[PDB]
Every structure is written in structure tokens, then in C-alpha cells.
Ligand binder design. Structure first.
Ligand SMILES: O=C(O)c1ccnc(C(=O)O)c1
Ligand SMILES: O=C(O)c1ccnc(C(=O)O)c1
Ligand code: NI
Ligand code: NI
Ligand SMILES: [Zn+2]
Ligand SMILES: [Zn+2]
Lengths: 330, 330
């Protein structure tokens, strides 16, 4: 078996290999990349997402989110407090202000230490889940707005036509902005491109060990667990690498820099943080190998978890026994 | 000047002419098609949207709408009463039931007479604005899920990058289901493909005469006009061809059949009805010629008009003086 230790693999496709997206995902999996839950892909030197990022300041962040923490430094939850709308230009200025700017640091490891030591004592503001794309329409390779849709994948594999659409989202981050431990909706794949700015550090648990993370989370957030059998779907819980190590949870970490893609694989739990002002674009996607994961995906039915229009058909077709209960939660 | 009488033109592109969508829209306009407000395009015989429609019955209509009329036979409003969810298979069975099925009729003109005589005395159920597509992903020509986005058009023309996405919608209709007099959001173009089933009859006012329709509507719906300076944006008012003729309003009519495209042009008011069970797909789009119409588009700020996520950026960039007032309405 390839990649038995479940290491995060890094790929350097040629421009020829960068033409057929589906084919290259399949290639990565043939080398065992999916066992880690996360892979990095560095585009060929001839490739670019768009010409420049000089004209993005007028994009609106309609609902910036202030991420307020509760708990202890290595085990905490965060809630999202809505703030007034602001443009990307205004947001960038805020990110670089004395209150919010990245501190002096020696290297990525030093900054990681500072993050886990000090995150809970600040409340950074995140510009998340903004429908849109920064890929040029003329970019034909790995354009996240031009991927095959999940609805078409389900139709091709299972023969049923369903409603729903599948479009990309933008994320504008600043120092200490945080994404909580989660898998994707319906345990889909995701792909994330860091367009511009400072790095993003990722943590990931191998899909074959996801249940170990779930069990620890139940122990560490006992009230939350009693409230919902799938509370990690709420995307609010953080556990540090030190605490994961203390509890023997298998995981890996890697830092993504501007110009790099990350792919998360079905049922790969991940979490992470931004180093400073940046912009990323992400979208979910499916392959034939996903279908079995979709059929088995846990669901939140307590009502807390956010849910897109497209989710209904996924649950309806792949999980008909769970559909009525889930629908009541929606 | 081409097409000075503003007649609805019908086009028969060859398979070669069907390759470049933008180029063919520009060609139609060079022949004066836009002066009518509406054009029909019959695809080349070699073209197909998808292989079959045999597997669409499991699509969900989450919120079917019962269209309840008030007023008189030729001048009425309709409101939408929400009904329980049903699949397309269930909806098709309902459309064909004795209560809702198309009556016996001699030809399209006979059915049109019956529609305007009897519409208000029934309340048909419409499956409208369902995000999704029935085009095969391998259909490369005139695939309504693969058009250039409005956001990219605005960026190309005016140099500013904006948030937002632009995806198609499905419409499942039955006898007497009705679309009220309206122009598109921001006076955009639209394109409509009738995938399957019974015909759709359209009425349209030439863009150069849109104000004449607005003035008559103010006279015929005086309370509505007092409530909102752009109340046709609410998409609830119907005026028959007989009443339009009585009041000297220039208009044209045409019936669309399965397998045919209709394009509406900026500020072309249109209305119409379905002949029986059918399914259509539609999306808005822009060209460089649209920008001046977008800048001048009326807006509803009374709060009634529905508004997509994408609308914000359009108003923000093209109509900054109106943005604050419009935003309060949203
Ligand atoms: O905020 C991010 O960068 C991020 C990373 C991974 N996943 C998500 C998500 O919402 O799935 C968001
Ligand atoms: O219901 C339709 O077929 C239809 C036709 C034209 N326009 C619209 C619309 O919502 O713009 C809907
Ligand atoms: Ni994620
Ligand atoms: Ni319309
Ligand atoms: Zn829950
Ligand atoms: Zn209004």
C-alpha cells in the first residue's frame, strides 16, 4: 500500500499534467496522497491564476466575522460575531493595523508557537464564505470556477439528475483568523488556492483515523457532544497540536504559501490559521471514490450546522433513511 | 436602421455559427433583433442539450408556488402561496390531473383566448427559480451553465473586480402558470431554453417603448404605484394583449416550443404563460452594450422585490448614488 504512514505529499505537475484535473487527482491517489487527508500541489512555472491582484480592493465583505474564543489556550471554541460591511481595501488596512498585524517572528515554527500561546486572548476578524472567484476566465487549467459539478458527478455515477449548483468561495484572512476542526459537507473533497498574501498553516488527521479525533472531541467538549451527535459539523472547536500529541491522535501539519493549491480528501479532518492578510479561494468537488463516503457521512440534525441549497439532494438520494430527521434540523 | 418596426426576429444558426455565443448575440443585434426586446433562436439540427429527459423525475421542487389572481380577466395581480415540497414526477402527475390539465383546443390562438378569458378563475402551481441545470456537461455550444459571467463582463469593461456568482435556474410549469410583466434585474439580458413539454407564449414591449408600458401600469394599478416607484419589479402585474391594444401600447407576441431558445434584451418588458407541463432553464447575462442600461436601471427600494446576492455589487458600482437607499430596502 502506498503512503502507509499517511504523510502529506507534495506534487509538482508539469504543464502537460496540469491539463486534466480529474486525471491528476486520480494520479495523486494512486500514489497514496489521500491517506494523509491533505495534499499540496505546486502549479507549473508557466501557470498563473490571473494577471495581477491590483484591482481587488472594491470587493465587498458584506458580513465580516469577529472570532471570539472561550476555553483554554489549547482547547477552545470560537463564536462568530457579525460586524458591519467593509471593502477588501478597508479590511486589508485593518489587518495591517497595530491591533491586528502579525507580530515579529523568526520563522513559521516561531509564529505557530505564538499562535497557540496567544490566540484566545484576541478576536481577529475574518472575511469568510464570500461567493465569487478571482480566477481569470481565460485560465483554463485548475480554474476553481470551471470544475465539473458535484451534481453532474452524482448523475454520472448513480444515474439520477438532481437540482443544485456548486460555485467557489473567497476567504479574506488576517493574523490569527482560524478555521476549526471539520470535514467537508457530506465528506466531500475540497480544493483551496491561496491567491495572495501571507501563509496559511494546516493541521490534518488521516481519514482512516478520523474517529479517534471525534472521540477526543467528545471528551474535551462534553456539553457540546451531549447537544449534538455530530457537533464538529458546527465548525467551532479547536484542539492544539500539543493536546493532540498528548492524546496520541495521529495528525500532520504543513504551511501553504501564496500560489499553492491544497486538496482535502473525503473525511480528512482539518483545522488551521492565517499568518497575516491573505486571500484564498475554495470549492468542494467529488470523484467516483467519494460516493461511498457521502453515503456514510455523519449529519448534524440539531439545527446549528449551516447548510447550502445543494445539500438537500445529497442527503435525499444518498441517505434516504436520515433525510426526514435531517430536514427537520434544517 | 435595422428592424425599425421592432418585430420579433427568428434565427437559424448553422453548427459553425453556434460555436461562439457572444459573437452570435452581436450578430443578431447587427440585424436589429434587440429592437423587439425578444428573439427566438432555433439550434442547428446537429445540436442537442442532453441525451434524454428520462431521468429527471427525482428533482425536488422545494417550494412550489400557487399563483392566486385578483382583479379582472385582462388586468390582474397574482400572489404566490407556498405549497409543500414535491418531486418533478409528482408535479408532472399533478399538472396532468383533471383539475390542472390543458383543455381541448384547436391551435395556439384558441388556447391564448382561453387563457385570457379564464386565467383568473384558477390557481395553477408553478415550480420556479430552482437553482440547477439540465444541460449535459459535454454540450459545448449554448450551454447555459457555461456562459461568461456578468461579474467577469463588468470587470472586463470597467476594470473592477467584484464578488458574486451567476448560475442557471429551472422552471417547471403547467397550464395557466404565468410570468408577470417585468424586465430583468438591473435590466440584464436573459436567455431561456425550453427543455421539454408543452409550449410557452411570450409577450414583449420594445425597449424603446418601455416607458409607455410603465405609464399604463401606473394607471391600472394605482395603489401599487403609490407604494413603490418601480412596482413592476415585484413581478406580480398582468395586462392582457387586448388591454395593451386598447391603450395603444406597442408589443409583440410569439410562442416558444420545446428545443428552442429565447433571448430577452436589456429593458425589454415581457410576460407570458405555459400551455401545459414543461421545463425551461434560464440565466441572466451581459454584453458591453448592457452597461449603459445597468447604469440607468430603475430600482425597487420598498423592500418587496426579491434580490440575489449578486445584485449588491451591480448597484454599488454602477449606481453609487442609489446604493444606500436601495440597501435599506434589502
Ligand atoms: O478558512 C479557510 O481557509 C478554510 C480552510 C479549510 N476549510 C475551510 C472550510 O470552510 O471548509 C475554510
Ligand atoms: O417563468 C418563465 O418561463 C420566465 C420567463 C421569463 N422571465 C422569467 C423571469 O423570472 O425573468 C421567467
Ligand atoms: Ni474545509
Ligand atoms: Ni424574465
Ligand atoms: Zn448539531
Ligand atoms: Zn417595491
Amino acid at each position: 500500500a502506498q503512503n502507509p504512514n499517511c504523510n502529506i505529499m507534495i506534487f509538482h505537475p508539469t504543464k502537460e499534467e496540469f491539463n486534466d484535473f480529474d486525471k491528476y487527482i486520480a494520479y495523486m491517489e494512486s500514489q497514496g496522497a489521500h491517506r494523509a487527508g491533505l495534499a499540496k500541489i505546486i502549479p507549473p512555472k508557466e501557470w498563473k491564476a490571473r494577471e495581477t491582484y491590483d484591482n481587488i480592493s472594491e470587493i465587498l465583505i458584506a458580513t465580516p466575522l469577529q472570532q471570539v474564543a472561550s476555553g483554554r489556550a489549547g482547547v477552545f471554541t470560537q463564536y462568530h460575531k457579525k460586524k458591519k460591511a467593509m471593502t477588501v481595501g478597508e479590511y486589508r488596512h485593518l489587518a495591517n493595523s497595530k491591533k491586528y498585524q502579525t507580530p515579529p517572528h523568526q520563522n513559521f515554527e516561531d509564529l505557530e508557537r505564538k499562535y497557540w500561546k496567544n490566540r484566545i486572548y484576541n478576536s481577529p476578524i475574518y472575511g469568510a464564505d464570500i461567493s465569487g472567484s478571482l480566477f481569470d476566465e481565460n485560465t483554463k487549467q485548475w480554474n476553481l470556477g470551471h470544475l465539473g459539478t458535484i451534481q453532474d458527478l452524482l448523475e454520472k455515477e448513480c444515474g439520477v439528475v438532481i437540482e443544485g449548483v456548486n460555485t467557489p468561495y473567497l476567504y479574506f484572512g488576517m493574523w490569527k483568523t482560524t478555521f476549526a476542526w471539520h470535514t467537508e459537507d457530506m465528506d466531500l473533497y475540497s480544493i483551496n488556492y491561496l491567491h495572495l498574501g501571507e501563509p496559511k498553516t494546516w493541521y490534518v488527521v488521516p481519514p482512516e483515523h478520523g474517529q479517534r479525533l471525534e472521540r477526543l472531541a467528545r471528551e474535551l467538549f462534553p456539553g457540546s457532544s451531549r447537544g449534538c451527535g455530530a457537533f464538529l459539523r458546527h465548525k467551532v472547536a479547536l484542539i492544539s497540536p500539543t493536546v493532540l500529541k498528548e492524546n496520541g491522535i495521529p495528525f500532520n501539519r504543513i504551511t501553504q504559501e501564496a500560489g499553492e493549491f491544497m486538496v482535502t480528501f473525503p473525511y480528512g479532518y482539518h483545522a488551521g490559521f492565517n499568518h497575516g492578510f491573505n486571500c484564498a479561494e475554495a470549492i468542494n468537488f467529488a470523484t467516483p471514490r467519494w460516493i461511498d463516503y457521502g453515503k456514510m457521512a455523519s449529519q448534524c440534525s440539531c439545527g446549528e450546522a449551516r447548510v447550502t441549497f445543494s445539500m438537500d439532494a445529497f442527503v435525499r438520494i444518498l441517505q434516504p433513511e436520515r433525510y426526514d430527521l435531517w430536514k427537520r434540523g434544517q
